[PDB]
Each structure stands twice: as structure tokens, then as C-alpha cells.
Design a protein around this motif. Structure first.
Motif, PDB file in Angstrom:
ATOM      1  N   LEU A   1     -41.655 -81.927  25.930  1.00 38.80           N
ATOM      2  CA  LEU A   1     -42.039 -83.196  25.260  1.00 38.80           C
ATOM      3  C   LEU A   1     -42.865 -82.900  24.005  1.00 38.80           C
ATOM      4  N   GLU A   2     -43.604 -81.785  23.973  1.00 34.87           N
ATOM      5  CA  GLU A   2     -44.476 -81.399  22.826  1.00 34.87           C
ATOM      6  C   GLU A   2     -43.616 -80.873  21.665  1.00 34.87           C
ATOM      7  N   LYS A   3     -42.397 -80.405  21.944  1.00 31.47           N
ATOM      8  CA  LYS A   3     -41.411 -79.968  20.919  1.00 31.47           C
ATOM      9  C   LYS A   3     -40.869 -81.177  20.137  1.00 31.47           C
ATOM     10  N   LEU A   4     -40.854 -82.376  20.729  1.00 26.74           N
ATOM     11  CA  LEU A   4     -40.411 -83.620  20.041  1.00 26.74           C
ATOM     12  C   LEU A   4     -41.493 -84.047  19.046  1.00 26.74           C
ATOM     13  N   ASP A   5     -41.076 -84.543  17.877  1.00 25.18           N
ATOM     14  CA  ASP A   5     -41.928 -85.287  16.914  1.00 25.18           C
ATOM     15  C   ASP A   5     -41.768 -86.774  17.243  1.00 25.18           C
TER      16      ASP A   5
END
Lengths: 229, 228
Positions: free
Chosen positions: B171-175
Motif C-alpha cells: 500500500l506504501e508503494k501506491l501514490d
């Protein structure tokens, strides 16, 4: 019932709706509440149709006898005073808001309200019936005395229309009659040509937003008018 | 021994062990994942099926609370449904009494207040589920998580369950400023497929729901074609 009578210079305009109602059903759609007493003295009849017709016929008959025996025209004051006596004598037995109005060459155009008590007030204009209550504010605001005969008729029709738009108990045709030195001019405006109705007034085209689709927002949009939307 | 038997009791350290233990029930539950975008919000939950013979839509963990709002339950599903039933009661009090769609922030606080109530009294136990409240009412797209303690917090994105840690890494890889609901349905489902234990939980599906501009700000399951 909406009845009114205004004075112009020469004479008077009586005006009336045309609906008798047994409460919430229209028994007669085209009544003539402008009732002849003499050539140039009419009354407008509000309340019990039975009671006002009975009085109008009694008073018309007295005025005709009177006119025959004095061998001269009847004064509106005379018609008003006769109508007051009868409306007063029987004030407990009858329900009868009368407006006597007419022309006589002595006093010109005259209007008399004889309301339910049997008071007789001489006035520049008189209102009567269930629909009268709508017009008091209409006259206060829009009525200007010293109108032409034509303006008074247009105004009286516009008045009756404003009353019968809001009064359930009033409706139908607007009957007027001008009484002056000239031959009486009756005219009957049908509802489909009335000078005002709420149905045709652009103010009241947009519907109240009462229905309102089930939404994810407190924003009022419009009425829900299709099951698909 | 007596320090942890009921939720009406603080320990010496100052904590409420029965609420921590209810928390443990969520952390051992099937992974749920959610994303709050400009367009709306998306919730994807892995359902671990015990049997090959369940119908599609059995043990739905995602439930419409109102037109604009939905709760996805990570934890004990039955407990979750009591919260759903309450969140509904609150959503319908907002429309019945105040003539407004309940705001997400409000609905979440109401869900948390309810879940917390059950942490204060000897006679009741904490709920065994974290509710994920997704809403798109007048306060915009909002994603909240009430946990068993009653603690509500707003999220851009959120993972709950046994792959919470690894699902969060992804989820932290998504902007979150950039992504749309249509991307998210893809990425959130992809995340749940990636983090899933293939050898432990053979039978499973990924139930996805959203509430976005696309869906008319209506909280619905996304069609089966978007899900992979």
C-alpha cells in the motif's frame, strides 16, 4: 363566494365569481350572484343562496312597486335601506352578506355593504363573501380610486380572479356589470380567459422539492420523476 | 490471573487485556485492504472459505451501511454484523431525524463509540472485528477503521488481518494523491492475491466494494470483471 363593487366617476362595477358550493362540491359552476333590483341598482349576493335570492326578489318587488307609485327613478340609498331592514329584521334566521350598488341621477354611483349583522355602510368599494378576505390586502395595495369605467372593470375582474385563485369556495366565471347613466353592460369572463390564475402564473411552475431521490448528498436537486432515476 | 478475565479491569501497566485479546482475533483473521482516492474509496477483503461447496457471496465481509457508506469487517464476521447493524441504525437515524446522509467522520465516531461501549462493562466483551468504514457523503471520500478498543482513525490506505504487515508494504508503494478508484480495485485485489498463503488457505476469493464518482457515490460490490 367572492363579490365586490367599486365606484368609478359616473357609476359602479359589481363583480362576482360564479360558484355555489355545498361545502367541497360545486353545485352550480355558473351562478349569477349579480342580482337586478331595478334597471340600474343591482345587489351582489353572498351566503345562503336561498336567503339572498328570497331577499333580492322581495326587495326587487318593493322597489318596482315604489318606482311605479312615486313615478320616478329609485335612489340606490332606497334599495340599500330596504335591503338593510330585511337583512336586519332576519339577522338570526338568514346568512346573507349583500352589496347593494347602482346608479341614480341624484347621487350617481353608490355602493352599500350590508354584511351579516344588517349594518349598512356606504363605501367607495365593497368586498363580500368567503373570497373577500383575500382582496382587502389586494385593494389596499393595488386599488387606486378615480379609475375609468374600463379600468374599474379590468381591476374588478383581476380582483375577483385573485380571490377565486385562493378561495376554494369561489371559482368559475367572473360576472361584472357596470351601472351608470348609460345602458347596463354585463360581461362574463370564462375561467380559461381569467386575468389571473395560479395555474398559469410563472411564479408557481417550478414544483416544491418535496419528493427528492435517495442520494449520497444533502444537496437538494429536484423531485424524483422516474423510477430509473 | 484475574487481571485479564474481563474488559472492566485495567492491568497494573494501565491496559485492558480483553481488548488486546479481541485485537488478536482480527490479526489472525483474513486480510482486508482499502484505499481512499479523490474519485472515492475502495475496500478489498480476502474471504478464506472452509469448504469448496460454498455459494459465491457466502460470508460477505462487506455490507452497505447506507447508500454512501459501507463497512468491511476484518475479524469475527458475526460480531462485525452487529456493528454493521448498528452503523445502519445510525445511518438511518441521520436520514430519519436530521434528513441528511450521515457523514463518514460521524458514522466512524458512532461505530467507535459503540465498539468502545463493549470495552467498559464486565457483562459484555469487546468486539472481535475491526470495522473498515468507507463513505462518500458530503465530507468527501473517507476511509476509517474502528478497532475492538473503539479507537477510530482516518486512513488514505489501510491493511488489517494476518498479512497486515506485508499488505501495508505494498500500500506504501501506491501514490494516493494520484490513483483513481479504477486503478485501486486492480492494485488492492492484486495486493490480496500476492500476500495470501497458497498452502495454508487453498479456497478463497477477493470480495471488492467501492463508493466512487463512477458508482454515483453509491456503496456497491465492484463487478467480477474489474476484480483481477
Amino acid at each position: 363566494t367572492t363579490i365586490l363593487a367599486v365606484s368609478y366617476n359616473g357609476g359602479v362595477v359589481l363583480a362576482a365569481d360564479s360558484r355555489t358550493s355545498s361545502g367541497t362540491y360545486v353545485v352550480n359552476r355558473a351562478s349569477n350572484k349579480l342580482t337586478k333590483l331595478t334597471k340600474k341598482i343591482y345587489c351582489c349576493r353572498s351566503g345562503s343562496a336561498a336567503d339572498t335570492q328570497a331577499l333580492a326578489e322581495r326587495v326587487s318587488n318593493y322597489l318596482g312597486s315604489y318606482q311605479t307609485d312615486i313615478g320616478a327613478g329609485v335612489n340606490v340609498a332606497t334599495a340599500a335601506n330596504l335591503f338593510q331592514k330585511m337583512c336586519y329584521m332576519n339577522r338570526w334566521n338568514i346568512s346573507a352578506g349583500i352589496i347593494v350598488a347602482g346608479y341614480d341621477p341624484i347621487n350617481g354611483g353608490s355602493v352599500y355593504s350590508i354584511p351579516s349583522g344588517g349594518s349598512c355602510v356606504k363605501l367607495d368599494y365593497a368586498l363580500g363573501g368567503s373570497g373577500s378576505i383575500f382582496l382587502y390586502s389586494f385593494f389596499d395595495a393595488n386599488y387606486k380610486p378615480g379609475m375609468s369605467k374600463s379600468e374599474c372593470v379590468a381591476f374588478c375582474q383581476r380582483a375577483v380572479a385573485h380571490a377565486y385563485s385562493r378561495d376554494g369556495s369561489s371559482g368559475g366565471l367572473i360576472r361584472t356589470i357596470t351601472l351608470d347613466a348609460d345602458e347596463p353592460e354585463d360581461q362574463t369572463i370564462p375561467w380559461n380567459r381569467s386575468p389571473y390564475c395560479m395555474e398559469k402564473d410563472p411564479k408557481y411552475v417550478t414544483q416544491a422539492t418535496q419528493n427528492q431521490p435517495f442520494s449520497s448528498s444533502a444537496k437538494i436537486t429536484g423531485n424524483r420523476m422516474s423510477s430509473t432515476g | 490471573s484475574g487481571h485479564d478475565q474481563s474488559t472492566d479491569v485495567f492491568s497494573a501497566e494501565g491496559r485492558v487485556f480483553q481488548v488486546e485479546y479481541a485485537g488478536k482475533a482480527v490479526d489472525n483473521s483474513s486480510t482486508a485492504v482499502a484505499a481512499c482516492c479523490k474519485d472515492g474509496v475502495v475496500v478489498a477483503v480476502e474471504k478464506v472459505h472452509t469448504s469448496r461447496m460454498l455459494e459465491k457471496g457466502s460470508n460477505n465481509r462487506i455490507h452497505a451501511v447506507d447508500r454512501q457508506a459501507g463497512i468491511c469487517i476484518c475479524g469475527l464476521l458475526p460480531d462485525g454484523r452487529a456493528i454493521v447493524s448498528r452503523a445502519r441504525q445510525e445511518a438511518e437515524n441521520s436520514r430519519d431525524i436530521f434528513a441528511t446522509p450521515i457523514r463518514g467522520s460521524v458514522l466512524a465516531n458512532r461505530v467507535g463509540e459503540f465498539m468502545h461501549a463493549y470495552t467498559t462493562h464486565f457483562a459484555y466483551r469487546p468486539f472481535g472485528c475491526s470495522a473498515i468504514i468507507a463513505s462518500y457523503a458530503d465530507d468527501g471520500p473517507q476511509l476509517f477503521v474502528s478497532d475492538p478498543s473503539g479507537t477510530v482513525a482516518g486512513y488514505y490506505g489501510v491493511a488489517l488481518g494476518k498479512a497486515k504487515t506485508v499488505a501495508k508494504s505494498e500500500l506504501e508503494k501506491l501514490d494516493f494523491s494520484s490513483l483513481t478508484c479504477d486503478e485501486a480495485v486492480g492494485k488492492l485485489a492484486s495486493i490480496l492475491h500476492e500476500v495470501h498463503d497458497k498452502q495454508k488457505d487453498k479456497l478463497y476469493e477477493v470480495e471488492v466494494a467501492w463508493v466512487c464518482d463512477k458508482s454515483d457515490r453509491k456503496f456497491v460490490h465492484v463487478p467480477a470483471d474489474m476484480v483481477p
